[PDB]
Design a protein around this ligand. Structure first.
Ligand SMILES: [Cl-]
Ligand SMILES: [Cl-]
Lengths: 45, 43
């Protein structure tokens, strides 16, 4: 299913997250998902 | 400077998140922070 969870971010990281998500027209959850998969592919299979 | 945020992940992304975090000895929060800075960088 969908899974709900609460994370803690520094204010700077959260502000950049919002900015990036808004620039891409994504929710922050979707922006984090893209970031996680980009990182995963960028180092590992 | 710490702030909370609730997010929704698919189970598949959450499992990849938990594996990566365990690998690196990081909380989910810290692993997401790493991945976000890598992504921000990637331009
Ligand atoms: Cl959002
Ligand atoms: Cl966490």
């Amino acid at each position: 299913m969908k899974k709900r969870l609460t994370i803690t971010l520094s204010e700077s990281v959260l502000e950049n997250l919002e900015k990036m998500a808004r620039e891409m027209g994504l929710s922050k959850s979707a922006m984090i998902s893209v970031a996680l998969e980009n990182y995963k592919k960028g180092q590992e299979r």
